[PDB]
Amino acid sequence: XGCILNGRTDLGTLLFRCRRDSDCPGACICRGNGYCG
């Protein structure tokens, strides 16, 4: 697998700065803005 950032309407994504997918929690991936999703 899951990804705690999928499907949320807060700014949880902004707690997870990423430069690559492996910076992200669970099976989340790094998105175009440099934060996980």
CSV table of N, CA, C and O in Angstrom, one decimal, unseen atoms left out:
chain,number,residue,atom,x,y,z
A,1,UNK,CA,1.8,-3.2,-1.0
A,1,UNK,C,1.1,-1.8,-1.1
A,1,UNK,O,0.9,-1.4,-2.3
A,2,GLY,N,0.8,-1.2,0.0
A,2,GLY,CA,0.0,0.0,0.0
A,2,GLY,C,0.8,1.3,0.0
A,2,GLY,O,2.0,1.3,-0.1
A,3,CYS,N,0.1,2.4,0.1
A,3,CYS,CA,0.7,3.7,0.1
A,3,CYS,C,-0.2,4.6,0.9
A,3,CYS,O,-1.3,5.0,0.4
A,4,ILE,N,0.3,5.1,2.0
A,4,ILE,CA,-0.5,5.9,2.9
A,4,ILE,C,-0.9,7.3,2.3
A,4,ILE,O,-1.7,8.0,2.9
A,5,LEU,N,-0.2,7.7,1.2
A,5,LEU,CA,-0.5,9.0,0.6
A,5,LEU,C,-1.6,9.0,-0.4
A,5,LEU,O,-2.0,10.0,-0.9
A,6,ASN,N,-2.0,7.8,-0.9
A,6,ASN,CA,-3.0,7.7,-1.9
A,6,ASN,C,-4.3,8.1,-1.3
A,6,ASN,O,-4.7,7.7,-0.3
A,7,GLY,N,-5.1,9.0,-2.0
A,7,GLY,CA,-6.5,9.3,-1.7
A,7,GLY,C,-6.7,10.2,-0.5
A,7,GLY,O,-7.8,10.3,0.0
A,8,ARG,N,-5.8,11.0,-0.1
A,8,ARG,CA,-6.0,11.9,1.0
A,8,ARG,C,-6.2,13.4,0.6
A,8,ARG,O,-5.6,13.8,-0.5
A,9,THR,N,-6.9,14.2,1.3
A,9,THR,CA,-7.1,15.6,1.1
A,9,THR,C,-6.4,16.5,2.0
A,9,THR,O,-6.8,17.7,2.0
A,10,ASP,N,-5.5,16.1,2.8
A,10,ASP,CA,-4.6,16.9,3.6
A,10,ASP,C,-3.3,17.1,2.8
A,10,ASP,O,-3.2,16.8,1.6
A,11,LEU,N,-2.3,17.6,3.5
A,11,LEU,CA,-1.0,17.9,2.9
A,11,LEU,C,0.0,16.8,3.4
A,11,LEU,O,1.2,17.0,3.5
A,12,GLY,N,-0.4,15.6,3.7
A,12,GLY,CA,0.5,14.5,4.0
A,12,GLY,C,1.6,14.3,3.0
A,12,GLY,O,2.7,13.9,3.4
A,13,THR,N,1.3,14.5,1.7
A,13,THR,CA,2.3,14.3,0.7
A,13,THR,C,3.5,15.3,1.0
A,13,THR,O,4.7,14.8,0.8
A,14,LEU,N,3.3,16.4,1.5
A,14,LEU,CA,4.3,17.4,1.8
A,14,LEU,C,5.2,17.0,3.0
A,14,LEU,O,6.2,17.7,3.2
A,15,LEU,N,4.9,16.0,3.8
A,15,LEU,CA,5.7,15.5,4.8
A,15,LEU,C,6.8,14.6,4.2
A,15,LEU,O,7.8,14.2,4.9
A,16,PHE,N,6.7,14.2,2.9
A,16,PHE,CA,7.5,13.2,2.3
A,16,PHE,C,8.2,13.7,1.1
A,16,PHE,O,7.9,13.5,0.0
A,17,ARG,N,9.3,14.5,1.3
A,17,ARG,CA,10.1,15.0,0.3
A,17,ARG,C,10.9,13.9,-0.4
A,17,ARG,O,11.4,13.0,0.3
A,18,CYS,N,11.0,13.8,-1.7
A,18,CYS,CA,11.7,12.8,-2.3
A,18,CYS,C,12.4,13.3,-3.6
A,18,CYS,O,11.9,14.1,-4.3
A,19,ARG,N,13.5,12.6,-3.7
A,19,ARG,CA,14.3,12.8,-4.9
A,19,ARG,C,14.3,11.6,-5.8
A,19,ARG,O,14.8,11.6,-7.0
A,20,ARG,N,13.7,10.5,-5.3
A,20,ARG,CA,13.7,9.2,-6.0
A,20,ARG,C,12.6,8.4,-5.3
A,20,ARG,O,12.3,8.7,-4.1
A,21,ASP,N,12.1,7.3,-5.9
A,21,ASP,CA,11.0,6.6,-5.3
A,21,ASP,C,11.4,6.0,-4.0
A,21,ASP,O,10.5,5.9,-3.1
A,22,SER,N,12.6,5.6,-3.8
A,22,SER,CA,13.1,4.9,-2.6
A,22,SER,C,13.1,5.8,-1.4
A,22,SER,O,13.1,5.3,-0.3
A,23,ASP,N,13.0,7.2,-1.6
A,23,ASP,CA,12.7,8.1,-0.5
A,23,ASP,C,11.3,8.0,0.2
A,23,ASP,O,11.1,8.6,1.2
A,24,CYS,N,10.4,7.3,-0.5
A,24,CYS,CA,9.0,7.3,-0.2
A,24,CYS,C,8.6,6.2,0.8
A,24,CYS,O,9.2,5.2,0.9
A,25,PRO,N,7.5,6.4,1.5
A,25,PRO,CA,7.0,5.4,2.5
A,25,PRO,C,6.2,4.3,1.8
A,25,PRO,O,5.4,4.5,0.8
A,26,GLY,N,6.3,3.1,2.3
A,26,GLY,CA,5.5,2.0,1.7
A,26,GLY,C,5.8,1.7,0.3
A,26,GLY,O,7.0,1.7,-0.1
A,27,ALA,N,4.8,1.6,-0.6
A,27,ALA,CA,5.0,1.5,-2.0
A,27,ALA,C,4.6,2.8,-2.7
A,27,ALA,O,4.3,2.8,-3.9
A,28,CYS,N,4.6,3.9,-2.0
A,28,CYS,CA,4.4,5.3,-2.6
A,28,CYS,C,5.5,5.5,-3.5
A,28,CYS,O,6.7,4.9,-3.4
A,29,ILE,N,5.3,6.4,-4.5
A,29,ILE,CA,6.3,6.8,-5.5
A,29,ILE,C,6.5,8.3,-5.5
A,29,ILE,O,5.7,9.1,-5.0
A,30,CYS,N,7.6,8.7,-6.0
A,30,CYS,CA,8.0,10.1,-6.0
A,30,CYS,C,7.3,10.8,-7.2
A,30,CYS,O,7.1,10.2,-8.3
A,31,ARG,N,6.6,11.9,-6.9
A,31,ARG,CA,5.8,12.6,-8.0
A,31,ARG,C,6.6,13.8,-8.5
A,31,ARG,O,7.6,14.2,-7.9
A,32,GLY,N,6.0,14.4,-9.5
A,32,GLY,CA,6.5,15.5,-10.3
A,32,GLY,C,6.9,16.7,-9.5
A,32,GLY,O,7.6,17.5,-9.9
A,33,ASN,N,6.3,16.9,-8.3
A,33,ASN,CA,6.6,18.0,-7.5
A,33,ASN,C,7.7,17.8,-6.4
A,33,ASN,O,8.0,18.7,-5.6
A,34,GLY,N,8.4,16.6,-6.4
A,34,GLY,CA,9.4,16.3,-5.4
A,34,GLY,C,8.9,15.9,-4.1
A,34,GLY,O,9.6,15.9,-3.2
A,35,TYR,N,7.6,15.5,-4.1
A,35,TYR,CA,7.0,14.9,-2.9
A,35,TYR,C,6.4,13.5,-3.3
A,35,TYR,O,6.0,13.3,-4.5
A,36,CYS,N,6.3,12.7,-2.3
A,36,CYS,CA,5.7,11.3,-2.6
A,36,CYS,C,4.3,11.4,-2.8
A,36,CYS,O,3.6,12.3,-2.3
A,37,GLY,N,3.7,10.4,-3.4
A,37,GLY,CA,2.3,10.2,-3.7
A,37,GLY,C,1.9,8.8,-3.8
A,37,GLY,O,2.7,7.9,-3.9
